[PDB]
């Protein structure tokens, strides 16, 4: 009778690793098909409840397990930084993520992984 027992619960298609730092120890977050919101809010797929992370910081959209995730910043206060090539990602502008790609949300360094590597 549970809500989740009715549904097709789709397995994770990727992983976001967060490196250890002033905010705490390393952590892995499962990423799913669709919109993975990165943000401070408790409901976010990648919930990073640090005061420097925007309530809705960024979004990693995964359309297919054979297509590159699409990263975009949601007009976060402290920005989203990519390194391919290095630059602050302007709100709305999509960035396709490669396996092992490194990104910063505010001062939190993260690395995206496929699951077939």
């Amino acid at each position: 009778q549970s809500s989740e027992s009715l549904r097709c619960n789709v397995e994770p298609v990727g992983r976001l690793h967060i490196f250890s730092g002033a905010h705490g120890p390393e952590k892995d977050f499962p990423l799913h098909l669709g919109k993975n919101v990165v943000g401070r809010m408790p409901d976010c797929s990648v919930a990073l409840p640090f005061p420097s992370i925007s309530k809705q910081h960024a979004e990693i959209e995964i359309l297919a397990w054979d297509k590159a995730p699409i990263l975009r910043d949601c007009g976060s206060l402290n920005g989203t930084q990519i390194l391919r090539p290095p630059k602050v990602l302007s709100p709305g502008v999509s960035h396709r993520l490669r396996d092992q790609e490194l990104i910063l949300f505010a001062d939190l360094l993260c690395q995206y992984h496929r699951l077939d590597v």
């Binding site: 401070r40 005061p51 420097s52 992370i53 925007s54 309530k55 976060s76 206060l77 402290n78 505010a106 001062d107």
Partner: peptide
């Protein structure tokens, strides 16, 4: 709460 600014 409001997002904190990072000081550099």
């Amino acid at each position: 709460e409001d997002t904190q600014m990072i000081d550099w």
